[PDB]
Amino acid sequence: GGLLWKIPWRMSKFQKLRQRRRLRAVDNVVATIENALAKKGETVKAVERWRAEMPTEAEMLPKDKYTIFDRKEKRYRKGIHKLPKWTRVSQRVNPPGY
Amino acid sequence: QSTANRTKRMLNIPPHESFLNVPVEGDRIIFNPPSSEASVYHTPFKFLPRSDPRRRANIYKLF
Amino acid sequence: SFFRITLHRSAIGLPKRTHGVLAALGLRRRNQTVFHPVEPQFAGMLMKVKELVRVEEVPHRLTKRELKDERKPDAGFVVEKQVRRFIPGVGVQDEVDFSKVGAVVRDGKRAGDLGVRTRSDWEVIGKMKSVLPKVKAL
RNA sequence: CAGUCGCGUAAGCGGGGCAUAGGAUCACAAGAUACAAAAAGGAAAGAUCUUGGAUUUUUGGAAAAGCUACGCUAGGGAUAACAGGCUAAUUUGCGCAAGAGUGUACAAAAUGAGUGCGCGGUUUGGCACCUCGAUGUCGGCUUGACUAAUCCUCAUGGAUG
RNA sequence: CGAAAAUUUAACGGAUCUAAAUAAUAUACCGAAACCUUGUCCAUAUGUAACAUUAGUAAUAAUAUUAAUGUUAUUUGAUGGGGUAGCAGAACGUUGAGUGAAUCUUAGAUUUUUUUUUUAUAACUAAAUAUAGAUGAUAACUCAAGUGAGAAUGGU
RNA sequence: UUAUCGGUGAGUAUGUAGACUCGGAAUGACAAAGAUGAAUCUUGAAUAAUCAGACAUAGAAUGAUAAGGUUGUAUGUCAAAAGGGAAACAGCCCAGAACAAGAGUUAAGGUUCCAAAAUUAUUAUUAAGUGAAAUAAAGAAAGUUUUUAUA
RNA sequence: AGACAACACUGACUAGGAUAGCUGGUUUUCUGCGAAACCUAUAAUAGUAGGCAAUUUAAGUAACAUCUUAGUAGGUACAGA
RNA sequence: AUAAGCAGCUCAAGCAAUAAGAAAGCGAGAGCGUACCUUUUGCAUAAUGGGUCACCAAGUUAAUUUUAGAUGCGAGCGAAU
Ligand SMILES: [K+]
Ligand SMILES: [K+]
Ligand SMILES: [K+]
Ligand SMILES: [Mg+2]
Ligand SMILES: [Mg+2]
Ligand SMILES: [Mg+2]
Ligand SMILES: [Mg+2]
Ligand SMILES: [Mg+2]
Ligand SMILES: [Mg+2]
Ligand SMILES: [Mg+2]
Ligand SMILES: [Mg+2]
Ligand SMILES: [Mg+2]
Ligand SMILES: [Mg+2]
Ligand SMILES: [Mg+2]
Ligand SMILES: [Mg+2]
Ligand SMILES: [Mg+2]
Ligand SMILES: [Mg+2]
Ligand SMILES: [Mg+2]
Ligand SMILES: [Mg+2]
Ligand SMILES: [Mg+2]
Ligand SMILES: [Mg+2]
Ligand SMILES: [Mg+2]
Ligand SMILES: [Mg+2]
Ligand SMILES: [Mg+2]
Ligand SMILES: [Mg+2]
Ligand SMILES: [Mg+2]
Ligand SMILES: [Mg+2]
Ligand SMILES: [Mg+2]
Ligand SMILES: [Mg+2]
Ligand SMILES: [Mg+2]
Ligand SMILES: [Mg+2]
Ligand SMILES: [Mg+2]
Ligand SMILES: [Mg+2]
Ligand SMILES: [Mg+2]
Ligand SMILES: [Mg+2]
C31 and C9 Cβ atoms separated by less than 8 Å: no
Q: What's the Å distance between residue A5 CA and nucleotide D98 C1'?
A: 39
Handedness of CA C123, C125, C131, C132 (dihedral sign): negative
With a CB cutoff of 8 Å and minimum separation 6, the contacts of A88 are C9, C11, C13, C14, C51, C52
End-to-end CA distance of chain B: 46
Whole-angstrom CA distances from B35 to A24, A69, B16, B21, B43 are 47, 60, 11, 18, 18
**How many angstroms separate the CA of A3 from the C1' of D75?**
32
How does DSSP classify residue A85? T
Q: Ligand 18 centroid vs A83 CA: distance in angstroms?
A: 70
Residues forming beta bridges with residue A79, ordered by sequence position:
A67
- Chain F positions within 7 A of any protein Cβ atom are 28, 34-38, 40, 55-60, 67-68, 75-77, 84, 86-89, 91-96, 100-103, 106-111, 115-117, 132-135
Write the CB contacts of B35 (distance below 8 Å, at least 6 apart in sequence): none
- Residue C137, SS3? coil
Task: Please tell me what resolution, in angstroms, this structure has.
Answer: 3.0
Nearest 5°: the CA angle C2, A33, C33 is 45
Interatomic separation, CA of residue B15 and C1' of nucleotide E99, rounded (Å): 72
Whether A and B touch, i.e. at least 3 CB pairs below 8 A, reads as: no
Return d(Cα C98, Cα C78) in angstroms, integer: 9
CA distances from A7 to A4, A79, A81, A88 (A): 9, 10, 9, 18
Q: From the list A46, A84, A90, which residue is nearest C44 (CB)?
A: A46
